[PDB]
Amino acid sequence: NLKLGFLVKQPEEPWFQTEWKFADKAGKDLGFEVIKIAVPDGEKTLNAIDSLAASGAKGFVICTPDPKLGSAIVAKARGYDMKVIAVDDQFVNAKGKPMDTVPLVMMAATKIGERQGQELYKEMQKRGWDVKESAVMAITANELDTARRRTTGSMDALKAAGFPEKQIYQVPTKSNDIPGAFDAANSMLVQHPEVKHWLIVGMNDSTVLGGVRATEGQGFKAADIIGIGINGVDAVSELSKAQATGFYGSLLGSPDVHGYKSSEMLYNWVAKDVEPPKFTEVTDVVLITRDNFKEELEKKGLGGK
Numbered sequence: 001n002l003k004l005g006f007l008v009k010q011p012e013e014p015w016f017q018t019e020w021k022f023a024d025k026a027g028k029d030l031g032f033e034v035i036k037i038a039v040p041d042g043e044k045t046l047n048a049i050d051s052l053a054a055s056g057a058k059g060f061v062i063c064t065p066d067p068k069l070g071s072a073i074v075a076k077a078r079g080y081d082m083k084v085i086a087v088d089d090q091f092v093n094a095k096g097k098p099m100d101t102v103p104l105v106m107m108a109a110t111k112i113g114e115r116q117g118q119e120l121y122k123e124m125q126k127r128g129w130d131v132k133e134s135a136v137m138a139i140t141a142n143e144l145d146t147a148r149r150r151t152t153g154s155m156d157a158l159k160a161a162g163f164p165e166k167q168i169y170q171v172p173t174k175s176n177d178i179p180g181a182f183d184a185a186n187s188m189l190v191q192h193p194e195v196k197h198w199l200i201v202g203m204n205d206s207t208v209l210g211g212v213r214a215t216e217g218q219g220f221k222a223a224d225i226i227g228i229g230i231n232g233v234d235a236v237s238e239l240s241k242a243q244a245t246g247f248y249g250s251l252l253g254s255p256d257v258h259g260y261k262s263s264e265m266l267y268n269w270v271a272k273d274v275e276p277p278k279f280t281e282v283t284d285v286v287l288i289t290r291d292n293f294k295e296e297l298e299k300k301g302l303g304g305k
């Protein structure tokens with residue numbers, strides 16, 4: 001009978017789709033209805049809450065399209081006697097300090113990032129690239145913490161592994177999608193004619209994919225590119241292709257956990273006024289490649305690949 005909202009920034013990415021799916025499950029289990037809304041931008045976010053209130057929802061889980069909407073979201077919520085839980089992306093203040101006060105469930109950004117970096121270097125070593133003619137292209141979205149911590153973690157790990165600091169080139173992307181990353185990567189490539197082999201660093205699948213698509217456009221062959229995405233579920237279409245590409249594999253997270261856990265906690269909070277922990281960090285990761293993606297998806301109950 002109880003209605004709880006599940007707002008996501010990017011409903012077109014399997015990650016978010018899966019979070020929805022597992023929110024549904026939680027609903028089934030606990031006996032509550034999930035109202036699934038896309039909030040791609042700030043306005044739609046604020047409008048969506050209004051709409052929720054109309055429907056007579058008692059709270060919502062949200063991945064905000066903008067961390068800096070935090071204040072507004074909370075205010076609107078309070079006004080409607082709605083409880084909020086943040087998923088994925090953390091609320092920040094005007095000054096861009098994290099709002100500790102809102103319960104969050106997110107991925108262990110740093111740890112996953114560092115695992116990306118490890119695995120990048122590992123595959124490089126495998127291929128016997130000459131470091132001298134190799135480079136790292138780091139496509140960044142520094143304004144998003146969880147993203148920041150990811151790419152920084154990757155760079156740290158690479159630097160730690162012995163990859164020359166001076167051969168790591170960062171480029172900000174305007175959007176956390178393929179088109180965005182494509183533009184970014186493209187602009188960086190034409191600057192570095194000397195490079196023969198690229199490692200591509202990005203916070204998620206799409207970002208890395210964007211990077212890869214760009215390199216192919218500048219006449220790099222698969223052998224000469226290593227990109228490892230983050231998310232896993234986002235990467236399935238790529239890993240499924242006949243031909244191997246620059247996109248070598250992905251770190252599979254737990255969007256199932258994100259969806260289910262966040263919803264479950266909201267309900268309890270709403271229904272039973274059981275205060276969720278302020279911070280939940282999900283540490284799950286597995287490397288999925290062309291060779292294993294199918295197993296691992298099925299293994300994690302994210303069947304289909």
Ligand SMILES: OC[C@H]1O[C@H](O)[C@H](O)[C@@H](O)[C@H]1O
Pocket residue numbers: 013015063087088089106107146176203204230231
């Ligand atoms: O929490 C994981 C989540 O982090 C951000 O929201 C990214 O945009 C997503 O694609 C995903 O990787």
